[PDB]
Amino acid sequence: GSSGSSGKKSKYMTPMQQKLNEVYEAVKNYTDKRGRRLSAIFLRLPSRSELPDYYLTIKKPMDMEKIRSHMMANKYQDIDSMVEDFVMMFNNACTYNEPESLIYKDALVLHKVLLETRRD
C-alpha cells in the first residue's frame, strides 16, 4: 500500500523529517578519495574580527550551521528547500576560493553528491 499528504507550512511532526537529516549527515560523513572531510572546512567560518576581508568579498555568507540549526528546529519544509541552499554554499566558494585549491574541486563533489541523494 501507499499514501500521501500536502499542506505543510508550520512546525508539525512528519516522517519526512528523517530525510532532511540523513541527507545532511551524508554530506558530513562523505570524505575524499583518501579520508579528508570536505564539510570540515565548511563547518565553522572565521568571524569578522578574525577574517574580516572575507565578509567584504562574500556579501551572502552561508555556513553548514545555517541549515542544520534551522533544520533541527523543524524549520525547513522539503528537501528541495535545503538543497537550493547548499548550492549557494558552493557557488560562492567557486569565486571566494581559487580555481586551483582543495576547497574548489572538493566543493563540486559535495554538489554532485547532494544532487544524487534526492529521491524521486
UniProtKB/Swiss-Prot annotation:
There is a cross-link at residue 11 (Glycyl lysine isopeptide (Lys-Gly) (interchain with G-Cter in SUMO2)). Transmembrane segments: none annotated. The modification Phosphoserine is found at residue 47. Residues 11-120 form the Bromo domain. It comes from the Eukaryota. Coiled coil: none annotated. It is found in: Nucleus. Component of the SWI/SNF-B (PBAF) chromatin remodeling complex, at least composed of SMARCA4/BRG1, SMARCB1/BAF47/SNF5, ACTL6A/BAF53A or ACTL6B/BAF53B, SMARCE1/BAF57, SMARCD1/BAF60A, SMARCD2/BAF60B, perhaps SMARCD3/BAF60C, SMARCC1/BAF155, SMARCC2/BAF170, PBRM1/BAF180, ARID2/BAF200 and actin. Interacts with PHF10/BAF45A. Interacts with acetylated 'Lys-14' of histone H3 (H3K14ac), and may also interact with other acetylated or methylated Lys residues on histone H3. Involved in transcriptional activation and repression of select genes by chromatin remodeling (alteration of DNA-nucleosome topology). Required for the stability of the SWI/SNF chromatin remodeling complex SWI/SNF-B (PBAF). Acts as a negative regulator of cell proliferation. This is Protein polybromo-1. It comes from Mus musculus (Mouse). The gene is Pbrm1.
